[PDB]
Design an enzyme around this catalytic site. Structure first.
Site, short mmCIF file in Angstrom:
data_model
loop_
_atom_site.label_atom_id
_atom_site.label_comp_id
_atom_site.label_asym_id
_atom_site.label_seq_id
_atom_site.Cartn_x
_atom_site.Cartn_y
_atom_site.Cartn_z
N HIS A 32 5.32 3.92 5.66
CA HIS A 32 6.07 2.89 4.94
C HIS A 32 5.61 2.92 3.46
O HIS A 32 4.41 2.96 3.19
CB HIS A 32 5.79 1.53 5.59
CG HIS A 32 6.20 0.36 4.76
ND1 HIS A 32 5.31 -0.36 4.00
CD2 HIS A 32 7.42 -0.19 4.55
CE1 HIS A 32 5.96 -1.31 3.35
NE2 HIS A 32 7.24 -1.22 3.67
N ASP A 33 6.56 2.87 2.53
CA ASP A 33 6.26 2.94 1.09
C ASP A 33 5.20 4.03 0.82
O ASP A 33 4.12 3.76 0.29
CB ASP A 33 5.77 1.58 0.57
CG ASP A 33 6.87 0.53 0.55
OD1 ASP A 33 7.94 0.77 1.15
OD2 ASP A 33 6.67 -0.54 -0.06
N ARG A 69 11.13 5.27 -2.16
CA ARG A 69 11.89 4.30 -2.94
C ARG A 69 11.89 4.78 -4.38
O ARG A 69 10.83 4.90 -4.99
CB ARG A 69 11.20 2.93 -2.90
CG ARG A 69 10.76 2.48 -1.52
CD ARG A 69 11.95 2.33 -0.58
NE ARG A 69 11.53 1.86 0.74
CZ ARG A 69 11.17 0.61 1.02
NH1 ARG A 69 11.20 -0.32 0.07
NH2 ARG A 69 10.73 0.30 2.23
N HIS A 82 7.77 0.33 -6.65
CA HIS A 82 7.53 -0.67 -5.64
C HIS A 82 8.11 -1.96 -6.21
O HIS A 82 7.39 -2.76 -6.81
CB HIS A 82 6.07 -0.88 -5.30
CG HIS A 82 5.89 -1.84 -4.17
ND1 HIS A 82 5.43 -1.46 -2.93
CD2 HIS A 82 6.27 -3.14 -4.05
CE1 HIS A 82 5.54 -2.47 -2.09
NE2 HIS A 82 6.05 -3.50 -2.75
N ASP A 274 1.94 1.50 7.96
CA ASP A 274 1.20 1.36 6.71
C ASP A 274 -0.15 1.98 6.98
O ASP A 274 -0.44 2.42 8.09
CB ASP A 274 0.97 -0.09 6.32
CG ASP A 274 2.16 -0.70 5.62
OD1 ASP A 274 3.17 0.00 5.45
OD2 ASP A 274 2.09 -1.89 5.24
O1 LIG Z 1 10.17 -4.97 1.23
C1 LIG Z 1 11.01 -4.53 2.32
C2 LIG Z 1 10.23 -3.75 3.30
O2 LIG Z 1 9.45 -2.73 2.64
C3 LIG Z 1 11.17 -3.13 4.40
O3 LIG Z 1 10.44 -2.37 5.36
C4 LIG Z 1 12.19 -2.28 3.72
O4 LIG Z 1 12.91 -1.48 4.64
C5 LIG Z 1 13.08 -3.23 2.99
O5 LIG Z 1 14.21 -2.53 2.51
C6 LIG Z 1 12.24 -3.88 1.82
O6 LIG Z 1 13.03 -4.82 1.08
#
Ligand SMILES: O[C@H]1[C@H](O)[C@@H](O)[C@H](O)[C@@H](O)[C@H]1O
Length: 296
Positions: A32-33, A69, A82, A274
């Site tokens: 994630h991220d 992202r 972010h 994460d």
């Molecule tokens: O902050 C959120 C989060 O990171 C979710 O997992 C993501 O899929 C969304 O689009 C985001 O707005």
């Protein structure tokens, strides 16, 4: 391949799996991220930081799906963001790490999810999609095949999961509904279905439950090759203190790793998480990979 010992090899775990298995059926760990590992400024960390090691560490650890992202800038490039904050990482930087990794381990493949994170900088010439598709997606590592993408057609390439609208080039997974902060289910292609558990901003209790509950649905629907299951175990909140995604991750990860360990499932889906590291004793990414034993 035929031996199970091959799944214990993180750099090449997808090697023993059959060329005909659709990517949907495979249990793939993800992050994630993914690009927030360079945030080393304290207050930025307790809010933004969701990873502590780089893309390559991440890949050499079994991660085959990246939560990317981006954002368009004046220089007409796409960088990683972010929210409104600039992670000091760019799109090119990702695509290159994935290429080095992919050439060192050609048996693997990687799914890159791209989402337009922030609004374009004022001096951009083109839109987000058009810029990504004319300056990047046109590169050959990107697989341009659509439909229920099989493993054979993806080895060596970069499969794209589109979280941006206004696409014009065919390839990978088509953009779909994805409502905010919930678990939902939609159709992707003619032959595909998606169940997503993306409850960020929720209480620990509800979070833990949503993961296991969605995980239970996949364990059961295990032999349905045309149905993806994305299961984000991440939960970001008003961190500041021990409430940051690290604190939650230090519980949610071991918790869910063991849950898979005991249940001995034959399918867990795509588990995006994460803090992928080697601290949390049980190891979620390894358990998710192992649940693929049933495909060999
Ligand atoms: O902050 C959120 C989060 O990171 C979710 O997992 C993501 O899929 C969304 O689009 C985001 O707005």
């Amino acid at each position: 391949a035929s031996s199970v010992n091959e799944l214990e090899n993180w750099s090449k775990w997808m090697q023993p799996i059959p060329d005909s298995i659709p990517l949907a059926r495979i249990s793939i760990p993800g992050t994630h991220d993914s690009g927030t590992f360079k945030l080393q400024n304290p207050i930025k960390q307790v809010w933004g930081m969701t990873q502590e090691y780089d893309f390559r560490y991440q890949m050499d650890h079994g991660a085959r799906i990246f939560d990317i992202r981006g954002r368009l800038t004046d220089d007409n490039t796409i960088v990683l963001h972010h929210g409104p904050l600039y992670l000091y990482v760019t799109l090119h930087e990702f695509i290159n790490e994935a290429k080095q990794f992919l050439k060192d381990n050609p048996s693997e493949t990687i799914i890159m999810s791209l989402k337009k994170e922030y609004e374009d900088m004022k001096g951009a010439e083109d839109s987000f999609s058009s810029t990504f598709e004319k300056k990047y997606f046109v590169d050959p590592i990107f697989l341009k095949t659509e439909g229920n993408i099989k493993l054979g057609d993806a080895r060596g390439k970069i499969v794209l999961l589109k979280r941006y609208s206004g696409s014009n080039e065919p390839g990978g997974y088509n953009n779909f509904y994805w409502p905010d902060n919930e678990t939902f289910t939609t159709t992707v292609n003619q032959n595909a279905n998606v169940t997503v558990q993306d409850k960020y901003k929720v209480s620990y209790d509800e979070k833990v439950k949503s993961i296991k509950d969605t995980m239970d649905e996949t364990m059961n629907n295990s032999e349905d090759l045309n149905h993806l299951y994305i299961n984000f175990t991440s939960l970001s909140s008003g961190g500041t203190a021990w409430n940051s995604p690290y604190y939650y991750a230090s519980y949610i990860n071991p918790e869910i790793a063991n849950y898979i360990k005991q249940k001995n499932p034959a399918r867990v889906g795509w588990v995006i998480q994460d803090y992928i590291n080697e601290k949390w004793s049980p190891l979620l990414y390894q358990e998710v990979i192992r649940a693929n034993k049933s495909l060999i």
